[PDB]
Amino acid sequence: ELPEDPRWELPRDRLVLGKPLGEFGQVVLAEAIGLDKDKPNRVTKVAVKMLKSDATEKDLSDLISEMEMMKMIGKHKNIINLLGACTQDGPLYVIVEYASKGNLREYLQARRPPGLEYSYNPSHNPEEQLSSKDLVSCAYQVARGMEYLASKKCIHRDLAARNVLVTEDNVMKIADFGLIDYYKKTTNGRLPVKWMAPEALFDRIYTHQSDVWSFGVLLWEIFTLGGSPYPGVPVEELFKLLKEGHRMDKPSNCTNELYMMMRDCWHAVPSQRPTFKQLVEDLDRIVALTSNQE
Ligand SMILES: CCN(CC)CCCNc1ncc2cc(-c3cc(OC)cc(OC)c3)c(NC(=O)NC(C)(C)C)nc2n1
């Protein structure tokens, strides 16, 4: 059984379980009644993490460890925050903030410019549009979340648009910050090794500097509007591209300044990469000078 932490405990009758969000344990959408003591009468839409039917002892241990890690890291606007937990007299439920617009990759792709007669999906026409200032603002918010996590001594190890969630208010929130098959693909069929720093991939050295490399790939994802890094590149060819010092091309509609930022994040020497603190400062300055007119 689990011990009661009254800092986070929410009674079971206060959580109304809803539709599944996905399946790593399962996550469902829910409504929490009286999450805050003012008001005990207000419902808040939340995401709830719980274990699947065939859950092992280590699966439960990992869920507990992730919840424990979130309590220790504390609160920030640009991370998925812990809101509560149902630990007593039933299955463990970990309650976190809800991001109604899904992950950053989905959010960017759904807001791509309309489809033309040469496009894969010519019928694509979103009722939602992103200016150049909006894309730099996304990168600023993610850098801010990462700067906070780094100040808390947290190394993400899988920073990518898939692990950034977007709220109803377009706030970027870093996800899965408190959690190794190189050939294993994601839910969307992409290879996570494509976000890894060379020293993380070849020497298994994970630092804030290796997360900055990943953030460089995340920036390329923002400016390609959810583009796929190295499409058609298998793991062994990726390794060779990295050993050769190859770097991804400059996306179109991306300033020389922002491509230089990407390239700086991808410095071969980890110590020479900008820190998250420098990236937040450079991004804050760039946001203010970036046109929202297109
Ligand atoms: C239905 C609308 N749709 C829009 C396209 C989808 C909206 C999806 N929103 C949404 N919000 C908040 C969520 C929070 C966590 C979440 C993040 C955490 O980080 C710290 C920790 C956590 O537990 C401890 C849960 C989460 N983790 C998942 O593993 N999820 C799947 C299985 C879908 C990949 N998934 C969320 N998903």
Author numbering: 464 to 486, 489 to 644, 651 to 765
Provide the authors' original text about this structure.
activation loop conformational energetics in FGFR1. function of FGFR1, as has been postulated for other kinases. crossed in the transition between DFG-in and DFG-out states. kinase suggests a high free-energy barrier for the DFG flip.
pathway models for the binding of PDA and ponatinib to FGFR1. were determined to be enthalpy driven and entropy driven, respectively. interaction between the t-butyl group of PDA and the P-loop. in the PDA-bound ensemble, while Phe642 was significantly protected. with either ligand-free or PDA-bound states. ponatinib complex compared with the unbound or PDA-bound kinase.
